[PDB]
Amino acid sequence: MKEKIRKKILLAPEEPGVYIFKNKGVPIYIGKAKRLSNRLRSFLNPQTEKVFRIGEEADELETIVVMNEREAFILEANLIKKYRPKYNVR
Ligand SMILES: [Mn+2]
Ligand SMILES: [Mn+2]
Ligand SMILES: [Mn+2]
Ligand SMILES: [Mn+2]
Ligand SMILES: [Mn+2]
């Protein structure tokens, strides 16, 4: 994993949000979290081959802090429909 992505993961807040891994400007995986810190730190010790691939292929990580868990649910669904990222199921 790129050093800049590891740093961004370790700085993420204990707040609800949506996250987007990208390569060359294109989303490759979109997810949501009750706490961005907890879900993003799980990418550091990969429990599945899919989690390993997402963290190695990415050259960028974007995070979006939201108002609450209801906003996280609908924003994540809308962005998956818009971008159809390679590692999200269809
Ligand atoms: Mn590494
Ligand atoms: Mn999801
Ligand atoms: Mn496996
Ligand atoms: Mn980055
Ligand atoms: Mn960007």
Swiss-Prot record:
Protein location: Cytoplasm
Which residue intervals define the domain GIY-YIG in the entry?
14-89
What does this chain do? Answer: The UvrABC repair system catalyzes the recognition and processing of DNA lesions. UvrC both incises the 5' and 3' sides of the lesion. The N-terminal half is responsible for the 3' incision and the C-terminal half is responsible for the 5' incision.
Q: What is stated as this protein's family in its record?
A: Belongs to the UvrC family.
Q: How does it assemble?
A: Interacts with UvrB in an incision complex.
What protein name applies here? UvrABC system protein C
Name the source organism.
Answer: Thermotoga maritima (strain ATCC 43589 / DSM 3109 / JCM 10099 / NBRC 100826 / MSB8)
Show which stretch of the intact protein is covered: 1 to 90 of 557
